């Protein structure tokens, strides 16, 4: 779906997160909330898909004599048909669920970005590559407030207004 | 001005998986469900009861 460009080999502590760059330096930091949700979901998904397969055991093959060729062919047909059915189910579930897994992760990306955008409606400016430039100073406390979803827009609204309108 | 970015993980893993839309997709983390090797030994399960 709405995929992106770029990768973050430096962020080693989670599926998703931020790269902050302020007066106090720069750094990577993983969003523990959304990655935690994604890990919960993918774990429950893998477990459900696998648990459905778990059913009963049964010694597969049967041996029939020379006056029983036909029920013998029917038994081999049954064994082999259950083999095909289970193989096909496993194959397609693998394929489709890897597809849907990548899509789920993409959507998590989108959700995180839109959350941050709603917090920083006007006080910042969308760079385009998937970042934000602040029209004000966002120090470490400000960064953390944005990261845990408690950014204070009226706090910096006036500073951002002055700088933003100074540009134009 | 200060900048704040959003991104996601990458590593040196070469694990390739297939999807319906695309095949040999290299991913960060994967699990092989298929066991495809054996020791080649008719060994005992909990006792040398095998005859």
């Amino acid at each position: 779906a709405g995929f992106i460009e770029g990768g973050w080999t430096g962020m080693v502590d989670g599926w998703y997160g931020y790269h902050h760059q302020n007066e106090q330096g720069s750094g990577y930091a993983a969003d523990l909330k959304s990655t935690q949700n994604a890990i919960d979901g993918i774990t429950n998904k893998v477990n459900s898909v696998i648990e459905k397969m778990n059913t009963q055991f049964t010694a597969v093959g049967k041996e029939f004599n020379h006056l029983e060729k036909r029920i013998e062919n029917l038994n081999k047909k049954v064994d082999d048909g259950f083999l095909d059915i289970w193989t096909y189910n496993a194959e397609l579930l693998v394929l489709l669920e890897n597809e849907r897994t990548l899509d789920y992760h993409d959507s998590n990306v989108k959700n995180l970005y839109e959350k941050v955008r709603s917090q920083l409606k006007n006080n910042a400016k969308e760079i385009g590559n998937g970042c934000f430039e602040f029209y004000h100073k966002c120090d470490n406390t400000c960064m953390e407030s944005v990261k845990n979803g408690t950014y204070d827009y009226p706090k910096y609204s006036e500073e951002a207004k002055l700088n933003r309108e100074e540009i134009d | 001005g200060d900048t704040l970015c959003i991104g996601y993980h990458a590593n040196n893993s070469t694990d390739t998986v297939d999807t319906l839309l695309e095949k040999n997709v290299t991913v960060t983390h994967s699990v092989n469900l298929l066991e495809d090797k054996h020791n080649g030994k008719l060994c005992s399960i909990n006792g040398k009861q095998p005859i």
Partner: antibody
Framework: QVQLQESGPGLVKPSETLSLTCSVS????????WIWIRQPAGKGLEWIGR???????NYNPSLRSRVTMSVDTSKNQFSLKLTSVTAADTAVYYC???????????????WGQGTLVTVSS | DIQMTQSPATLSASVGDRVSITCRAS??????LAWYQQKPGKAPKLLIY???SLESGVPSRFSGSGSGSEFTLTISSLQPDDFAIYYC?????????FGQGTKVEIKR
């Protein structure tokens, strides 16, 4: 193997600055978060905190005011610096490596050897 | 933030007996608990992560079961080398918290 050794003074005077240095064997410290954890004698364990070279550290609240974590990429080490030690913080220290993302969250497989820091006059 | 009740403090069981250590949490966790074994004056060694992930090289006798607020470490057959203090750690939310630990002795 990645191996973590620990160097501490053994004694710190009650109103001084504890400096501890964990040395790493064969890993690029710049690419891992590094954790400090501690145990008062035979009592329970306490997560001190986490630091990373191109990231943002995070420390335990009760020690936050006093802890600074740094990293020497030149010497391949990372150091704790605790201000205003108290003799109650008199314990074994351990340094651990925070491994990368796995399916079961983040793991600390590697562990230091533990050094006693006792705070006495 | 997150308070850890690891019962019971002291145990002593004969070889081969099953052993269960309970690690209740102040707040529920989506099975992000881990179990470590600390030998006498030695580096604590992790046993199981994700409350269900037996770390590589750990004997299969160890099984971790739990999600939400209740988790249990279960040693299927207690062996001599399994005498130590066992701690349960939580990496759901900082600050990372441990239990007071459970000392597992051996009846001989």
């Amino acid at each position: 193997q990645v191996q973590l050794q620990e160097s501490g003074p053994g004694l710190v005077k009650p109103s001084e600055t504890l400096s501890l240095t964990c040395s790493v064997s064969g890993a690029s410290i710049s690419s891992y978060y590094w954790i400090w954890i501690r145990q008062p004698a035979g009592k329970g364990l306490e997560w001190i905190g986490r630091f990373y070279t191109s990231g943002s550290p995070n420390y335990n609240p009760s020690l936050r005011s006093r802890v600074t974590m740094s990293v020497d990429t030149s010497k391949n080490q990372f150091s704790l610096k605790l201000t205003s030690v108290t003799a109650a913080d008199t314990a074994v220290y351990y340094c651990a490596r925070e491994e990368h993302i796995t399916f079961g969250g983040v793991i600390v497989r590697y562990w230091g050897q533990g050094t006693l820091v006792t705070v006495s006059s | 933030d997150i308070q850890m009740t690891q019962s019971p403090a002291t145990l002593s069981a004969s070889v081969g007996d099953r052993v269960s250590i309970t690690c209740r949490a102040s707040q529920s966790i989506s099975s992000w608990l881990a179990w470590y074994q600390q030998k006498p004056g030695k580096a604590p060694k992790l046993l199981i992560y994700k409350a269900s992930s037996l770390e590589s090289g750990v004997p299969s006798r160890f099984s971790g079961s739990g999600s939400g607020s209740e988790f249990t470490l279960t040693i299927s057959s207690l062996q001599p080398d399994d005498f130590a203090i066992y701690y349960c750690q939580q990496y759901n939310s900082y600050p990372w918290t441990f239990g007071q630990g459970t000392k597992v002795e051996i009846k001989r």
